[PDB]
Write an enzyme that holds these catalytic residues in place. Structure first.
Site, PDB file in Angstrom:
ATOM      1  N   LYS A   1       0.814  -1.210   0.000  1.00 22.81           N
ATOM      2  CA  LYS A   1       0.000   0.000   0.000  1.00 22.81           C
ATOM      3  C   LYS A   1       0.840   1.249   0.000  1.00 22.81           C
ATOM      4  O   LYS A   1       1.953   1.247   0.547  1.00 22.81           O
ATOM      5  CB  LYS A   1      -0.926   0.007   1.228  1.00 22.81           C
TER       6      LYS A   1
ATOM      7  N   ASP B   1       9.301   3.835 -16.685  1.00 21.41           N
ATOM      8  CA  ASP B   1       7.882   4.205 -16.680  1.00 21.41           C
ATOM      9  C   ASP B   1       7.691   5.717 -16.616  1.00 21.41           C
ATOM     10  O   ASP B   1       6.868   6.226 -15.859  1.00 21.41           O
ATOM     11  CB  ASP B   1       7.095   3.483 -15.562  1.00 21.41           C
TER      12      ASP B   1
ATOM     13  N   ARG C   1       1.712  10.909 -15.414  1.00 24.44           N
ATOM     14  CA  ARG C   1       1.162  10.426 -14.137  1.00 24.44           C
ATOM     15  C   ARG C   1       2.279  10.164 -13.105  1.00 24.44           C
ATOM     16  O   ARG C   1       2.002  10.119 -11.893  1.00 24.44           O
ATOM     17  CB  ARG C   1       0.316   9.179 -14.353  1.00 24.44           C
ATOM     18  N   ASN C   2       3.544   9.982 -13.587  1.00 25.21           N
ATOM     19  CA  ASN C   2       4.696   9.765 -12.715  1.00 25.21           C
ATOM     20  C   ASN C   2       5.457  11.044 -12.392  1.00 25.21           C
ATOM     21  O   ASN C   2       6.529  10.988 -11.781  1.00 25.21           O
ATOM     22  CB  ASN C   2       5.623   8.630 -13.220  1.00 25.21           C
TER      23      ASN C   2
ATOM     24  N   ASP D   1       8.106   7.958  -9.293  1.00 27.30           N
ATOM     25  CA  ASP D   1       7.521   6.714  -9.801  1.00 27.30           C
ATOM     26  C   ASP D   1       6.630   6.203  -8.708  1.00 27.30           C
ATOM     27  O   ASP D   1       7.112   5.750  -7.676  1.00 27.30           O
ATOM     28  CB  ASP D   1       8.585   5.660 -10.226  1.00 27.30           C
TER      29      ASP D   1
HETATM   30  C1  LIG Z   1      14.032   7.484  -9.514  1.00 29.11           C
HETATM   31  O1  LIG Z   1      13.709   8.508  -8.579  1.00 29.11           O
HETATM   32  C2  LIG Z   1      12.539   8.383  -7.881  1.00 29.11           C
HETATM   33  C3  LIG Z   1      12.177   9.347  -6.960  1.00 29.11           C
HETATM   34  C4  LIG Z   1      10.994   9.215  -6.258  1.00 29.11           C
HETATM   35  C5  LIG Z   1      10.159   8.127  -6.459  1.00 29.11           C
HETATM   36  C6  LIG Z   1       8.876   7.990  -5.693  1.00 29.11           C
HETATM   37  O2  LIG Z   1       7.799   8.490  -6.495  1.00 29.11           O
HETATM   38  C7  LIG Z   1       6.589   8.676  -5.883  1.00 29.11           C
HETATM   39  C8  LIG Z   1       6.315   8.319  -4.576  1.00 29.11           C
HETATM   40  C9  LIG Z   1       5.056   8.552  -4.055  1.00 29.11           C
HETATM   41  C10 LIG Z   1       4.057   9.139  -4.815  1.00 29.11           C
HETATM   42  C11 LIG Z   1       2.680   9.389  -4.230  1.00 29.11           C
HETATM   43  C12 LIG Z   1       2.204  10.826  -4.310  1.00 29.11           C
HETATM   44  C13 LIG Z   1       0.960  11.155  -4.790  1.00 29.11           C
HETATM   45  N1  LIG Z   1       0.486  12.402  -4.884  1.00 29.11           N
HETATM   46  C14 LIG Z   1       1.322  13.378  -4.465  1.00 29.11           C
HETATM   47  N2  LIG Z   1       0.883  14.635  -4.543  1.00 29.11           N
HETATM   48  N3  LIG Z   1       2.565  13.195  -3.971  1.00 29.11           N
HETATM   49  C15 LIG Z   1       3.012  11.927  -3.891  1.00 29.11           C
HETATM   50  N4  LIG Z   1       4.241  11.753  -3.403  1.00 29.11           N
HETATM   51  C16 LIG Z   1       4.338   9.497  -6.128  1.00 29.11           C
HETATM   52  C17 LIG Z   1       5.589   9.271  -6.666  1.00 29.11           C
HETATM   53  O3  LIG Z   1       5.954   9.590  -7.944  1.00 29.11           O
HETATM   54  C18 LIG Z   1       4.973  10.196  -8.779  1.00 29.11           C
HETATM   55  C19 LIG Z   1      10.540   7.169  -7.385  1.00 29.11           C
HETATM   56  C20 LIG Z   1      11.720   7.290  -8.094  1.00 29.11           C
END
Ligand SMILES: COc1ccc(COc2ccc(Cc3cnc(N)nc3N)cc2OC)cc1
Length: 294
Positions: free
Chosen positions: A28, A148, A152-153, A166
């Site tokens: 989750k 990816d 949306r990411n 991500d």
């Molecule tokens: C490769 O570098 C990376 C750096 C960070 C991450 C983690 O990414 C995320 C981690 C959590 C979330 C959830 C999320 C949703 N809405 C808002 N408003 N903020 C958030 N946080 C979103 C994410 O990406 C869109 C993954 C890879």
């Protein structure tokens, strides 16, 4: 810096889970409050996992701790004191970029019941694009392959700040943007080049192809790439060499930049540094100054 190589550990007491954001690939995802770091954070959880799954969790924390940049979603550290294991990220003020683009699209403006949003301007699109290209230059410098990249990411903060992350959603629970390539692996085909679809080869160059698709999403106000097509039709277009249409309003140089991302041969695609330089130049010549509503 050298210190970022070492994962920051966070006390369990300093994290308060608030609500679920969605099902992640390994557990989750929650909105939470974090103290002595209160601020809102997004946490990825790993519940009652095997020794190998917990080993993978620490290896992922060791990868993320070192990816720190102005246009990369902030990784704050982990809490492994109890169960579930917790990965802590910043919670951005304005949510995901795909929702943001759609909220500022011509349809949202037309269908607004009360005070309408402002339609996203070309200058605002360029500003978003250059920041994503900046994050991608950074990830390539770190030999990190995203796999990816999609709006949306990406997340939006104050002052139209944009960062790449991500969410790593469960691709089985939320299958809209994924396809079971070879009947084996859920992959985001609409954002992928031919070699990634056909040979499962992912590189800095397949991320460049995805960046071209992200530019198409930006300039179309968040429309789904190839929305007119089924997944099998998408695969046929990509592998045959058909391209996404030019957005209604897009600078011609920006559509040609997209086309440069979509060269069939990975080595012949536009280089990430060049893509960033061009977008940075176009954005500086068309700066953001108008108020943004809704
Ligand atoms: C490769 O570098 C990376 C750096 C960070 C991450 C983690 O990414 C995320 C981690 C959590 C979330 C959830 C999320 C949703 N809405 C808002 N408003 N903020 C958030 N946080 C979103 C994410 O990406 C869109 C993954 C890879």
């Amino acid at each position: 810096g050298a210190m970022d190589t070492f994962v920051q550990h966070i006390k369990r007491h300093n994290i308060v889970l608030k609500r679920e954001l969605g099902e992640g690939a390994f557990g989750k995802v929650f909105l939470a409050e974090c103290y002595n770091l209160k601020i809102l954070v997004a946490v990825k959880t790993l519940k009652d996992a095997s020794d190998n799954a917990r080993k993978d969790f620490h290896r992922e924390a060791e990868l993320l701790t070192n990816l720190q940049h102005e246009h990369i979603v902030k990784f704050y550290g982990v809490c492994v004191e109890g169960d579930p294991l917790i990965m802590v990220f910043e919670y951005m003020k304005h949510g995901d970029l795909n929702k943001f683009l759609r909220a500022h699209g011509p349809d949202a403006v037309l269908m607004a019941e009360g005070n309408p949003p402002t339609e996203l301007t070309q200058s605002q699109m360029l500003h978003i694009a250059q920041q994503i290209a900046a994050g991608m230059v950074y990830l390539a410098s770190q030999h990190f392959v995203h796999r990816d990249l999609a709006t949306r990411n990406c997340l939006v903060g104050e002052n139209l700040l944009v960062k790449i992350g991500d969410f790593g959603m469960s691709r089985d629970v939320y299958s809209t943007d994924y396809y079971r390539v070879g009947g084996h692996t859920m992959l985001p085909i609409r954002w992928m080049p031919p070699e990634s679809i056909m040979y499962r080869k992912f590189t800095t160059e397949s991320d460049v192809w995805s960046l071209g698709v992200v530019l198409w999403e930006i300039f179309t106000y968040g429309k789904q790439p190839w929305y007119q097509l089924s997944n099998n039709e998408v695969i046929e277009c990509i592998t045959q060499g058909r391209v996404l249409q030019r957005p209604r309003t897009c600078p011609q140089e920006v559509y040609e930049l997209m086309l440069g991302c979509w060269q069939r041969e990975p080595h012949m695609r536009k280089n990430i540094k060049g893509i960033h330089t061009l977008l940075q130049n176009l954005a500086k010549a068309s700066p953001v100054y108008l108020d943004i509503l809704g």
